[PDB]
Amino acid sequence: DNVTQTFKINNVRAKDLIRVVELFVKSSNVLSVDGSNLLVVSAP
Amino acid sequence: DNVTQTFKINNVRAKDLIRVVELFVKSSNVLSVDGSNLLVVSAPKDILDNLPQFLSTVDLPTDQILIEGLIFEVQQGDALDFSFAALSVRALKTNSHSKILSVPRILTLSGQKGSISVGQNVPFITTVERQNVGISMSVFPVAMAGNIVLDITIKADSLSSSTQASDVITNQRSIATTVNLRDGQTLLLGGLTDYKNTSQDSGVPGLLFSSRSDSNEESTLYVLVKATIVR
Amino acid sequence: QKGSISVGQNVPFITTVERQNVGISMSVFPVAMAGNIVLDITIKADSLSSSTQASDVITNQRSIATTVNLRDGQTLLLGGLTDYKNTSQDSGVPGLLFSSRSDSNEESTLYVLVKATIVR
Ligand SMILES: C[C@H](CCC(=O)NCCC[N+](C)(C)CCCS(=O)(=O)[O-])[C@H]1CC[C@H]2[C@@H]3[C@H](O)C[C@@H]4C[C@H](O)CC[C@]4(C)[C@H]3C[C@H](O)[C@]12C
Ligand SMILES: C[C@H](CCC(=O)NCCC[N+](C)(C)CCCS(=O)(=O)[O-])[C@H]1CC[C@H]2[C@@H]3[C@H](O)C[C@@H]4C[C@H](O)CC[C@]4(C)[C@H]3C[C@H](O)[C@]12C
């Protein structure tokens, strides 16, 4: 394997897009750094 | 195998970057020495070779936001009691005006909660439970790209002299919402305008009492909010 | 490390009683970085009221609690509240002729500033 990247969320709070992104990566793997609206995801 | 290195965190507290760094190393392995903002991580060397470039995408300079609430209540008002007992003639012409402008302010880092409360702490029977009664504004802003998403509660309360109930009656005024603000914009987070035009008139369709009341209350409350990214 | 300063009065409050500081206090938890300081801060400025309108003692409160980011010798407006009340009243006649008139023009402003300095 899993790489870990950070994604900048621009329009919505990154915290609301955790469950949605938990599905995309499903097969804690998604976290939100609330300060700088970022999603750290670990997945293939 | 595991090497153990220390990494200096420069822009954010090293304690907030523990869960994030726990993922990068996942396959207690990350600890924070809070004094000198350091992260001690234990993981294979390979993993620990790429940690420098992850901490340059997660350890960024956070922005500070200046929320500036604005509460504004104008209350006009009039009246005209007018008896004509038949020859006593009572009258009255009470006017009244009121302008209250309360401007609360609070600076907070993005992604942190901040609150300002100025008023009185009053005990309320429930056994007693104390509770702030005055102007308060709790904020939780998150800056994005600039825009700010802001969860906000503005309460403007006061105590009443009414003894019509078990305990103390409070005069309440509250908004709680989440909005989206630009970097230096004012929004109408809400409001309430009110208008009462009461009118009364007892007459005769030997004494001849013949009163007449009137009233024309008008009130308007606005709650505005201006957020500004400090950087 | 956490540090706090509290100067005021310790007042008992019915809840059974529970004591509680009522005065100026400032609790801090700073972390210096590279210089910058991230500071979790609560400043409370309270006093006792003479009002007996309630079960127990009413306190006059003033508090900020936030987290901010300060440089090595900067002052920030950690917050504040300005207030303005312009009340005006006027009973008249549209044989006695009572004809009162009140007015008022309260204006108030509170500022809370904070200056952190790394000693080394
Ligand atoms: C008398 C003030 C003037 C405010 C002003 O001129 N500008 C805004 C910023 C205020 N500041 C916090 C910077 C100043 C505080 C003084 S301080 O001591 O902080 O320096 C406010 C209070 C009520 C306001 C109106 C109502 O809402 C209705 C309406 C809503 C729209 O949305 C914008 C248009 C409109 C017509 C408003 C215009 C104006 O806005 C008014 C007259
Ligand atoms: C009268 C004092 C003067 C303070 C001063 O001159 N400098 C700051 C440091 C104070 N010290 C702790 C070092 C001295 C204490 C005395 S000691 O006994 O500790 O030595 C303070 C109290 C209210 C202050 C203003 C308001 O906030 C609004 C505004 C905010 C901005 O942000 C900066 C600009 C401005 C216009 C402010 C200027 C100034 O700031 C004022 C007049």
Author numbering:
A (entry chain B): 108 to 134, 140 to 156
B (entry chain A): 108 to 134, 140 to 198, 235 to 274, 290 to 308, 310 to 369, 378 to 403
C (entry chain O): 260 to 274, 290 to 308, 310 to 369, 378 to 403
What text appears in the publication on this structure?
We present here the cryoEM structure of the closed state of f1pIV to 2.7 Å resolution, the first near-atomic resolution structure of a phage secretin protein. Averaging the protein particles together in 2D showed that f1pIV particles are composed of fifteen identical subunits; no variation in symmetry was observed. The N-terminal part of f1pIV is comprised of two periplasmic N domains: the far N-terminal N0 domain (residues 1–88) and the N3 domain (108–172), which are joined together with a 19-residue linker (89–107). The fifteen subunits pack against each other to form the secretin channel, with each subunit contributing a four-stranded ß-sheet to the multimer, culminating in a large ß-barrel composed of 60 ß-strands. Within the ß-barrel is a smaller inner barrel comprised of four ß-strands from each f1pIV subunit. The inner ß-barrel is angled parallel to the pore axis and provides a scaffold for two extended loops that reach into the centre of the pore, known as Gate 1 and Gate 220. The interface between the outer and inner ß-barrels is composed mostly of hydrophobic residues, and strengthened further with a salt bridge between Glu 185 and Arg 337 (both residues are highly conserved amongst homologues). The interface between neighbouring N3 domains is mostly hydrophobic, and no hydrogen bond interactions are observed between them in our structure. For reasons of flexibility, the extracellular part of the ß-barrel was missing interpretable density (36 amino acid residues, positions 199–234) as well as the very centre of the pore in the Gate 1 loop (15 residues, positions 275–289). The far N-terminal N0 domain and its associated 19 residue linker region (residues 1–107) could not be observed in our structure. Two molecules of CHAPS were observed to bind to each f1pIV subunit, forming a circle of detergent around the barrel.
Instead, new virions are extruded via the phage-encoded pIV protein, which has homology with bacterial secretins. pIV is a secretin family protein, with sequence similarity to bacterial secretins at the core of the Type IV pilus assembly machinery and the Type II and Type III secretion systems. Fifteen f1 pIV subunits assemble to form a gated channel in the bacterial outer membrane, with associated soluble domains projecting into the periplasm. The C-terminal domain integrates into the bacterial outer membrane and forms a double-walled ß-barrel with a central gate forming a stricture at the centre.
